[PDB]
Design a protein around this nucleic acid. Structure first.
Lengths: 498, 314
DNA sequence: CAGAGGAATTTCCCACTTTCACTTCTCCCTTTCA
DNA sequence: TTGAAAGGGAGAAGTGAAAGTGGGAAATTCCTCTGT
């Protein structure tokens, strides 16, 4: 024989209950239940009527139908599931006391262990697939009946699954309901602004869905137009026929994109003729595309690479255009008053911060990658970036370590107690000036990604200046002698002192 | 005829600061000063007058009732430990600043043990006498030394005060009590001046203390006749304690007020109010007169910033 | 006298912002070279 | 009628990591109406 569900449990509308609420917390209503008439989950056992048993347990909504962590509670419920004796003279069975008790996330592992610990595993899902996040907002009832083969031995028949049951209290699975509308009428051209009061919705997964005699439209609003999850202010979409001679009654309803869920419709008839959130990545792409920031432009037709002007802000010729995108970000986020439509020229004190906020925000976003740091070539200082995944082709202690190594010629020790070391130091303007002469200098540039033997013109004075600048005002290290001027053997001598 | 004392220069801002449970992580911004604004921030400040070279000031959270008591919430951040902030100051400067001050929101079940532990520290330590705890042996000051053997009988007193106070405890409002100290002959900070208490600080997350704000509305105009329906969007309010008031300052210290018409059922999920407009001062008028609208909490008369509303003739 | 549903209390964590701890640059001269 | 670069010193700028910020919303717990 075989089990058949005759009355499915209502899918939306009932919230799960926490042990803490306990008390008398109703039971799972049946598919066809109304405010005036409640029905209950019901199965029919085709091809058998007699002694037997029925276990109803909870399982995952999706394919690897693992034992769900929540548990059934009510008459004849123990260890998380339901089990009772069948009525020998009825082949239709009703369950009117099924309650779903949801377990807390903190206690999820123990709950799952209890499920394995009690053999409540209908499809004997191997402990492997039995792991991975669980959707605690949805469950499916699993009916496991056991009749008896022609006189004698017991007989378990295929388990059957019910439609899933969603937690009405959980925000992303609750039942959608429009509660009050501003105006239920408007122009066939659309564009009339409407205020809709609703039940909890998620501003990032919800839409106002219009329909009717073979037609579909959607009101327009940014997430910023959804107020504290219970109010949406949008604009009416254009009607199919932009030339009415009479009004037309259409349907208006809330729609949850992710799963197609819909709410009861609200009449709306057409008649005859809030600042959006600035997300950094989306904002940046828009600004580069605008063509309004000299220097901020795409470097290809696919629009996967782009340059950002990056002149050092210590430069005295630093212009407005040089810092325009950095300032634009400050203004969009309200950290700097806009223009006309006071202000204080203390605007140049602000720019270093504007640059760092822009650099840091860009980095947090994780949506970009740096291809080339051309904030060097004096002519055009800028950086080049590529969007994540599309053509990602990136292209005192240190000295202490270096002292022992003394690899390259020119450097070594004079003090066999570690502290008095000799570094070369020939003046770059010497005809005899060698490339490997600034070898110790070259090591620092390479060892900081500052220099790459392949993709970087060599800059000897900078390598020397940066190596020197690092040491200088570094309390815990200083100079000794200074045969730098020495025409024959140029070189200095340093030492430490914590 | 005076002596050295502590003066609160800048008080901490009263509304809009969010208290934080420990599960929310440390630091979410420090309590603002009453003068602090948009992109120009400030903080609560104290000034030791009639100077005394070096000095160490401390801050504690006291309740807001008639009887200034020890609160169960705690101060955290910069220079804090056990809900007490301790900062040094006074070499030359006598004005101390308090940035990075956060208010740890203690849990309900948690308040009794926290209060008992917090008061016990007080009976034993030599900070503030039997004032914030209970009218009793208020000795054990910063006079001789710092520490006292908690008698068996004394312990019962702390427990009783803790039980009574936990019931009185209001977790939505708190106050700061500044206590300064001047050096000892030994250089130690034991010379205690008078304690000063700050303005009450309300938890912005408390519905009843929430800072009111009109976020958006249907229309900003109507006929002086009134009776027109409006759809207003606002920050969290309580259905039984909210009203929409219209008003215009009149000639010669005058002020006309009008109230939106609605029932608490009209308050939607604490975030919206659908109501009808009140009738203007006088029906038949010359031309469009503009007034102001504002949410106002009944229980405390607190209000939201005004928003312009234009009345026009029929 | 439940028990459906509105709130209040607590917990998470998004999406940047600022700071930490150093390292580099432009400025503005000086020196050095040839 | 001090030429072309390299060198130095100060100190503001620049940096990636790692905290700090400010909010909105999700998870949990309570508790009041509905209508005994």
């Amino acid at each position: 024989g075989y089990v058949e569900i005759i009355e499915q449990p209502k899918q939306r509308g009932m919230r799960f209950r926490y042990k803490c609420e306990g008390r008398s917390a109703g039971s799972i209503p049946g598919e066809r239940s109304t405010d005036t008439t409640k029905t209950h989950p019901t199965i029919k056992i085709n091809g058998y009527t007699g002694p037997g048993t029925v276990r109803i347990s909870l399982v995952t909504k999706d394919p690897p139908h693992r034992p769900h962590p929540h548990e059934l509670v009510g008459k004849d419920c123990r260890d998380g599931f339901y089990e009772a004796e069948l009525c020998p003279d009825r082949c239709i069975h009703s369950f009117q006391n099924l309650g779903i008790q949801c377990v807390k996330k903190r206690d999820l592992e123990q709950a799952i262990s209890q499920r394995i610990q009690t053999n409540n595993n209908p499809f004997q899902v191997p402990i492997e697939e039995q792991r991975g996040d669980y959707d605690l907002n949805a469950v499916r009832l699993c009916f496991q009946v056991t009749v008896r083969d022609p006189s004698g031995r017991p007989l378990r028949l295929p388990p059957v699954l019910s439609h899933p049951i969603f937690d009405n209290r959980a925000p992303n699975t609750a039942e959608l309901k429009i509660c009050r509308v501003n105006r239920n009428s408007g122009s066939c051209l659309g564009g009339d602004e409407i205020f809709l009061l609703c039940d909890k919705v998620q501003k990032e997964d919800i839409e106002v869905y219009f329909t009717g005699p073979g037609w579909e439209a959607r009101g327009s609003f940014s997430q910023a137009d959804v107020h504290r999850q219970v109010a949406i202010v949008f604009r009416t979409p254009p009607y199919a026929d932009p030339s009415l001679q009479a009004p037309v009654r259409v349907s208006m309803q809330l729609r949850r994109p992710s799963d197609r869920e819909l709410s009861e419709p609200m009449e709306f008839q057409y008649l005859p003729d809030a600042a959006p959130r600035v997300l950094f990545g989306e904002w940046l792409l828009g600004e580069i595309s605008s063509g309004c920031y000299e220097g901020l432009q795409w470097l290809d037709e696919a629009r996967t690479c782009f340059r950002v002007p990056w002149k050092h802000f210590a430069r005295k010729d630093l212009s407005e255009a040089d810092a325009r995108i950095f300032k634009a970000w400050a203004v969009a986020r309200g950290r700097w008053p806009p223009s006309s439509r006071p202000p204080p020229e203390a605007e140049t004190a602000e720019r270093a911060g504007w640059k760092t906020n822009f650099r840091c925000a860009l980095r947090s976003t994780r949506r970009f990658v740096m291809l080339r740091d051309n904030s060097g070539d004096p002519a055009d200082q800028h950086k080049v970036y590529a969007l994540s995944g599309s053509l990602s082709s990136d292209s005192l202690p240190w000295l202490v370590s270096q002292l022992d190594l003394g690899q390259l010629e020119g450097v070594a020790w004079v003090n066999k107690s570690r502290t008095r070391f000799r570094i070369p130091w020939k003046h770059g303007l010497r005809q005899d000036a060698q490339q490997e002469d600034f070898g110790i200098f070259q090591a620092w540039a390479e060892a900081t990604g500052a220099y790459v033997p392949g993709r970087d013109k060599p800059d000897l004075p900078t390598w020397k200046r940066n190596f020197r600048s690092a040491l200088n005002r570094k309390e815990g290290l200083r100079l000794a002698e200074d045969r730098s001027k020495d025409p024959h053997d140029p070189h200095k001598i340093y030492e430490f002192v914590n | 005829m005076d002596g050295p004392y502590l003066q609160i220069l800048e008080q901490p801002k009263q509304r809009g600061f969010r208290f934080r449970y420990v599960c929310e992580g440390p630091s979410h911004g420090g309590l603002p000063g009453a003068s602090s604004e948009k992109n120009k921030k400030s903080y609560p400040q104290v000034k030791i007058c009639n100077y005394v070279g070096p000095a160490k000031v401390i801050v504690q959270l006291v309740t807001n009732g008639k009887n200034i008591h020890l609160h169960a919430h705690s101060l955290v951040g910069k220079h804090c430990e056990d809900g007490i902030c301790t900062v040094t100051a006074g070499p030359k400067d006598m004005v101390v600043g308090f940035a990075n001050l956060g208010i740890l929101h203690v849990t309900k079940k948690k308040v009794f043990e926290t209060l008992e532990a917090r008061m016990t520290e007080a009976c034993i330590r030599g900070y503030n006498p039997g004032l914030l705890v209970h009218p009793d042996l208020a000795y054990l000051q910063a006079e001789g030394g710092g520490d006292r053997q908690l008698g068996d009988r004394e312990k019962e007193l702390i427990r009783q005060a803790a039980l009574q106070q936990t019931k009185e405890m209001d977790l939505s409002v708190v106050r700061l009590m500044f206590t300064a100290f001047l050096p000892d002959s030994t250089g130690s900070f034991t010379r205690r001046l008078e304690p000063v208490v700050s303005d009450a600080i309300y938890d912005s997350k408390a519905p009843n203390a929430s800072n009111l704000k009109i976020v958006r509305m249907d229309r900003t105009a109507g006929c002086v006749t009134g009776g027109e329906e409006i759809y207003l969007l606002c920050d969290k309010v309580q259905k039984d304690d909210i009203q929409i008031r219209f008003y215009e300052e009149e000639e010669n210290g005058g002020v006309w007020e009008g109230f939106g018409d609605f029932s608490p059922t009209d308050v939607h999920r604490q975030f919206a109010i659908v109501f009808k407009t009140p009738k203007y001062k006088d029906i038949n008028i010359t031309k469009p007169a503009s007034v102001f609208v504002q949410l106002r909490r009944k229980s405390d008369l607190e209000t939201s910033e005004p928003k312009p509303f234009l009345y026009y003739p029929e």
